[PDB]
Amino acid sequence: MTARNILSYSYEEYVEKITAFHGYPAPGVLIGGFMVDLAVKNLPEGILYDAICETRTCLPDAVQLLTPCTFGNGWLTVLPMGLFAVSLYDKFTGEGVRVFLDVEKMGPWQEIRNWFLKLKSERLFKEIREAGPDILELRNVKLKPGFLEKKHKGKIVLCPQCREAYPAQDGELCLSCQGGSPYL
Amino acid sequence: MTARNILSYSYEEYVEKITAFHGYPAPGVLIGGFMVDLAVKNLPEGILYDAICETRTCLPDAVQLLTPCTFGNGWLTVLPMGLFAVSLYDKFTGEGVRVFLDVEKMGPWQEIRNWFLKLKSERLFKEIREAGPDILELRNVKLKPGFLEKKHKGKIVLCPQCREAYPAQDGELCLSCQGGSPYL
Ligand SMILES: [Cl-]
Ligand SMILES: [Cl-]
Ligand SMILES: [Zn+2]
Ligand SMILES: [Zn+2]
Structure with a gap:
């Protein structure tokens, strides 16, 4: 029931858009929304940014759905390193912000943790929404x-x-x- | 002025959708539409297909915009080989169809040819629409x-x-x- 807008979308609008595009409201693309939202909120206002995803799973579609960066226009790069992280960076300078999941913050959220760590789903989905950006960490970066x-x-x-x-x-x-x- | 639907979209609806997503109505994504349309029309009816693009430029966004295959759900693979070709294939069997540009067919279309071969744009855009799938070739393939x-x-x-x-x-x-x- 927590209000959790993702850029200009409500969480429910965002869930709708991502099921349409990705095919399923996958946890990764939902979490991905919070990540891209926090990332955009931490770039200087009005700048032109490129994106990097460090995993090929899910996270690219959060970027493609929410930002002008797509795989086909080359503004999104995917480095398949298996790391659930995205950076958005100034195209001119290469200065940006990297966002990733902080497992230290997933105490109140064992379903997110079990998912993230693949330990062996109505509860998972409610938790992602409740947690919002609380399970995320941010770091300033500059591209090579x-x-x-x-x-x-x-x-x-x-x-x-x-x-x-x-x-x-x-x-x-x-x-x-x-x-x-x-x-x- | 030629009627040129792309799957369920009119050419003008498709141009709209692709400028929105990709950022510019790039020739590659326009041509890409004709390619994905011909490819889908040559798969058995109602089957579940994956996609492969053999270039990272433009063509992935045609696939992402028109098919359920996205980079983030893994149903789209991009092999960056610099070849302007896409294949759609049966996910179960690996049998599919590859579509690519046939320069032998770009006689009536020197603007498309100059673009395709990078030889050194209102005319280019009109030509893409007039040519439609006439500059395309199709081949049956089976994946490795x-x-x-x-x-x-x-x-x-x-x-x-x-x-x-x-x-x-x-x-x-x-x-x-x-x-x-x-x-x-
Ligand atoms: Cl990966
Ligand atoms: Cl390429
Ligand atoms: Zn490490
Ligand atoms: Zn060859």
Whole structure:
């Protein structure tokens, strides 16, 4: 029954939007909402930010649903490191904020803890909403130089093997024909 | 002025949705719409499919906007191989369809060709809509075994260095502390 807006959305509006997009109101994307909300609230007002998720699970959809950063526009980067953390950072300077879960704060919340630590769901969902940002920690960060590199003006050539267009830098065949092909 | 629906959307509804999500009605996401539409139209009726994009640029947002597959639910995989191609495949069997651009078909469309090949925009946008799926080719594919693997029931441990939770398989530190950290 606790009032828990996520950016401009009510918690119920946010649950609606995320089930629509992600397919299920997954704990990770719900918690993810609180994280992105706290992160945005701790950036300077009106700035243009990029995003980094340190896990591929759930958290990217919280970012995509709530921020202008998407996987397809490149403003969201996903580093698959298995860490339930997101950073939002100034695109010009690389200064930003990282938000992650603080298990030290999940005393009052054993369902969130059992979920987070995969220890072996109506109760879980109520807890996420009650906890809100109380299970989160924030830290100022600055991105490494490589994350703010000029993107390269690549020359497009034709792969002799599959006859598709690809960046010439990738080699004498495209990366698929080199062995990256997922297909039999 | 050509009628060009993209799944359930009109071309104008689709342009609206994609500018909202992606930030700009980028040629890639527009073309991407035609691709995902042709792909879905060539899967058996009513089946549950996963998606693969072979480039990170634009094409993922066409998939995310039009299909239930998202980066965060794991039903969309992005293989960053620089190839403007998407496949949709049966999640159970791995049989699917790959769609890509056929430059052989871009005779009537020099603006699309100049864009696709990066050779050095009101005209480009009109052409994409006029061309529709005429610049696309389709091929039946079956995914390699590794893309249909059972996902591992990982044990969650605490990184001694950063004291965040991570999968024990990753090592004695988490992948960030091992060196994957994007932060200074
Ligand atoms: Cl991950
Ligand atoms: Cl790529
Ligand atoms: Zn090739
Ligand atoms: Zn660590």
